[PDB]
Design an enzyme around this catalytic site. Structure first.
Site, PDB file in Angstrom:
ATOM      1  N   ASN B  81      -7.968   2.004 -22.839  1.00  0.00           N
ATOM      2  CA  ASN B  81      -7.458   3.344 -23.103  1.00  0.00           C
ATOM      3  C   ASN B  81      -6.321   3.705 -22.157  1.00  0.00           C
ATOM      4  O   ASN B  81      -5.365   4.365 -22.571  1.00  0.00           O
ATOM      5  CB  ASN B  81      -8.575   4.382 -22.985  1.00  0.00           C
ATOM      6  CG  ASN B  81      -9.820   3.993 -23.750  1.00  0.00           C
ATOM      7  OD1 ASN B  81      -9.792   3.109 -24.603  1.00  0.00           O
ATOM      8  ND2 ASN B  81     -10.924   4.665 -23.455  1.00  0.00           N
ATOM      9  N   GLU B  82      -6.411   3.296 -20.890  1.00  0.00           N
ATOM     10  CA  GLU B  82      -5.304   3.504 -19.961  1.00  0.00           C
ATOM     11  C   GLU B  82      -4.059   2.749 -20.414  1.00  0.00           C
ATOM     12  O   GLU B  82      -2.943   3.284 -20.364  1.00  0.00           O
ATOM     13  CB  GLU B  82      -5.713   3.056 -18.559  1.00  0.00           C
ATOM     14  CG  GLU B  82      -6.543   4.073 -17.795  1.00  0.00           C
ATOM     15  CD  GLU B  82      -7.084   3.518 -16.491  1.00  0.00           C
ATOM     16  OE1 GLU B  82      -7.497   2.340 -16.471  1.00  0.00           O
ATOM     17  OE2 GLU B  82      -7.098   4.259 -15.487  1.00  0.00           O
TER      18      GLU B  82
END
Lengths: 156, 156, 156, 156, 156, 156, 156, 156, 156, 156
Positions: B81-82
């Site tokens: 997700n980062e």
């Protein structure tokens, strides 16, 4: 700008169920050009275009994302990258539990949000009302039974 | 705004090596307040603050991200997700290979970019020159030998 | 100089499909003197000419290259040399996945560019629109159905 | 602009022989900043740079390419794209048959040009004379015996 | 009165092809309230109604009739009775040769009127143009290449 | 007269490590003809020459001496006679503790003079600075990181 | 002349504690070129220099002497000669009880002067204040907690 | 009204750690008439009063809750009832992980809110600053060191 | 007189399906007293009452008769007698094909009347509309999506 | 605001009995839009809503609460938090001992308040009278016998 589009974030291994879902969305009266579904030749990516840049443009300009969660959704990198890209920008979103998913909602998605199921007639009625509220449309009963029958036979 | 900070994306299972790495930066002359390493009590999230919103603020404002790639960075939903959050924003990025990562780069990260290794003296010299150019600092040879010896003993 | 010509890169083991493709290109209204297809007596190399010197002269001048990607395209040294030449020269390029190819797009060819298929009617419609836009032509529906039927019969 | 630089084309599976060859090249007196050997940390691509853009710029500028022909040079796509790239631009070239290769020179490379072997002392003497003539250098006999012994020990 | 309502005369053993044909008729833009296809729950005879008086009224009122001729249309008493009623009343008629029928057009139907085949792109184009002119509709090619593919997949 | 020369006293049983040491000097910029190392064919005694008269003359003229101290330097007569000759003549000298030696510096050599270790990077940096100031040379970091790596891998 | 330099008298056996104390001094903000800690390569005796003459010169010019009193300090001659050299010259001095030393202060150092123990937060605070007053430095609370944790971990 | 009080939720099996924590809170300068620690005779429920009505009034009127989370905190029903009562009322709250709690937060308290550990000096410094900002107090470094030593001795 | 009352003619071997049908009728809003279903203790014949005379009193006075046709309906002697009794009097009638009936309608029942199937959503919608028209009731969607689900789960 | 609604606290492992109890509640006459039973699709949380804030608002507004007390009601954290919320808010409460629960009533709910059983006809009669008096309803015995039989069959 593109708030009216519908970015259907999914996995390529959930092809049939997502196809039926998109077809129902079309049947209720959603224009076929508002569904950015990259597993159908009719809503996919134009030829001679950069795939990831094309997706990035739509996500950045603001698109109503649809997480079709399942086991394969959490087994694919690009799906999680898309989840992060929609989380950081704070795009309007909605969760959809595909049949057979009994797992835990991990990741940076809002875990305290009620998800839409697609298993019983009340679920489909709720989804239909949601879409009609979203796009300000109108549908009649006989058509609704016909669409329900089509969707149910497609899944079967 | 926060273009001068460093966001060290990593997996908590690589706590040791990353630790040494971040320490190296502080030795070269990076202020301890720039690194946003979230696995150390002195750089992590301040108490009584929402975790994910706190990270999102920094990522959205344009932190210079570091991809501390390894076999665990691809087995953790939050790291992916980062990666997605940095991809869609066009944040300044830089790849780094932890020792023992004999694998393939996946995801939307630029696969044709050149990564930094951290094994041989030339690798650490290149990283040191990169950081010195980034933050406009100066260093002496004796200090560099001391710092390199410290880093190497830490890794062992 | 040779910006408006088409250099149909292919393997000699895909003669039938490429013949149908070039015949369709001519049918849409592309002058047969523009296509450079070196497996047909009517577009090939003139007599008493150097093969590779002729091909290099055409590539160096900016011929719009089409990659007939297939299994035999990645098992031919000369085809990969043409790919490298057009890559370094930065010629305008377009990929075309021949029927039956389900492999990976290796080499220096842009792997993130969308490829044109030749299976469903929508793919042929998109190809026709691309050619008409490129060469500023026009076509009528009846002719389009006739051409599509001819192509399908040829491949069958 | 980059006529003087040497672009050592090779396959990554011939690392030892190419390492010995490039080390000998440096020993004769060729500055290490001219060799663009890509499998060497001291000659490879600078970090944070695009691999293929870097190589393409170096080839397009006129690097004096060396072919390390072997059984793996013809079983690697990227090597053949490099061959085509140097063929179309008409860069200065030179073939080198790695030990153990007894195949046929395929592709667009000049098949009627004499190749350089690396087996017997006369071959190394001819190679040394070539390099000295090319770069206008000088050497002494004792240094030559030392270099030859080092090379043979490396290969063994 | 009921002059704009399509009456589809057929046999009950050719229900798949007739279903596909009616779905195509609906796709082009024909209102579902017109097609009278008594083998579909959504177009058939309402419950608690006389089976034969309903069709008698519809035919007597002047419904456009389509003769879906085949090897079963001439092996069914009721179909020939509909043919006779249409002939006597002089209702508008249109012939349609279902795939596989290669026989004589017997009965009192015009044996000189040209039929409408449904086994090639030009035939479907002609049928589409006929319907569009009949109901004064409008269609776009991008939709046509999808409707035709749907039909072909159904028949296949 | 021969003050600019270097006389590397050692034991043949330390052939490997000493070898690397000499090579390191050659890389820094020490002329290969100024190192009198009598265990390498390229620096040893000439042919048809008295073994001991050569060393006696070189020590008499005032060659700089490096004591490669180890457990074998104190278990070899000739090494101790060389130490005695250096002591009596009062030639410039320097000690060097080879990896592994932990004993006492016996004999007539100055026991208070500080030694030169060859274990950690700071030791190699100090040795490099000593040689550079001794022979009035100049070096660059990008090459020092390579020379040190060569030395470490050879000793490894 | 050298009154601004620290001279850490100690015994080689008490190495870890002295190393931690020197590191603490460096982090507080004392230049690394002032501490004279002969058991560390980075502050030890430069090579090719007289050990005892070097220490004698440094003590004669003037330097604060920190007596790391312990059991091994009173079981080593050179430590006692260092104490005597400090006493006769009237050099500025300070005492520092090492952990575990529960003996009696002997020799010629004032037995009534108060010593600096290091086994509790208050002692470290007092030492930090003393050093800051000595060198006119400044420190912040967060850095102080970090340094205290580092020192305690090192001693552990 | 009672928003200035500090309700300390805990379990009776964690008497010692909470006692030390409350003593530290008092030492920093928190009035003893604010803390409502139940397990202390000096802050407990006054006699001749309903045990539960007192806590009900205090929670209802508003009170800064301090979840002293631990394993025994999730085995006491009353603690969970206090958690729910403070959750529904929207009471200002904070979390404190007692030593040895390796579990995960459950219930209806923010699982994404950063908590205050009490293991290392930096944690106690952060807690001290939090309290000082909360109640607008002041402290001295030596006093802080004494307080920290007392707390560590108590916890040991 | 009793025209309002329904008279569900059936066979006792179709108990489950008829029970579900009667429960659906009750759910839509039909008073439980009207139904004269004789296989249920709540609508059956009172005690100490003549069975056949009790049924005749209802059939003679007039009652909407539902024919739950199936193989068992044509395998009993009493059901056909009820069919004749309702045929002679000309009572209002309605057919209903229970699932699995693939046979032919026989007897004196009007064989050209369209019958209500119960298999698919459109059939249940038609039945619901019929009943609402009959008894002049109103039903909302959210209730129908639950009543229908009850019906299918019972039938399953 | 919500004094006339019913909140049904329960565990998710006792869903069958609670479903039967809620169905009985609707049967007696309670409107289906007043029961908040989060384990049923027809009474649960609307989609795209916060799971916990919805219940928080309902409880804070004063919803009548029933405690389905059982063995699984004391193993669930969330139920014990709803109990505390009701206790602090002073919402109207009623206990209900599910079959098989023969334990102690812990928590902060009145232990001296008499509970309601659901195992014998008198208990169901008392519950029915309670509900009828609560909502001012009316019921008839002929319906009550059927309702009780339905409930008993469901529990069986």
């Amino acid at each position: 700008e593109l708030e009216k589009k519908i970015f259907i974030s999914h996995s390529s291994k959930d092809k049939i169920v997502c196809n039926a879902f998109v077809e129902l969305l079309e049947d209720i009266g959603v224009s076929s050009e508002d569904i950015i579904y990259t597993s159908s030749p009719y809503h996919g990516i134009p030829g001679d275009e950069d795939i990831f840049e094309y997706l990035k443009k739509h996500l950045f300009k603001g698109a109503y994302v649809f997480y079709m969660l399942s086991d394969n959704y959490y087994d694919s990198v690009y799906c999680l990258n898309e989840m992060g890209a929609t989380w950081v920008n704070s795009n309007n979103c909605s969760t959809f539990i595909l049949p057979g998913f009994k797992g835990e909602i991990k990741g940076v998605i809002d875990k305290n949000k009620k998800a839409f199921s697609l298993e019983e007639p009340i679920d489909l009625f709720n989804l239909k009302e949601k879409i009609l509220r979203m796009y300000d449309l109108t549908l009649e009963d006989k058509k609704w039974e016909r669409i329900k029958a089509k969707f149910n036979t497609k899944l079967k």
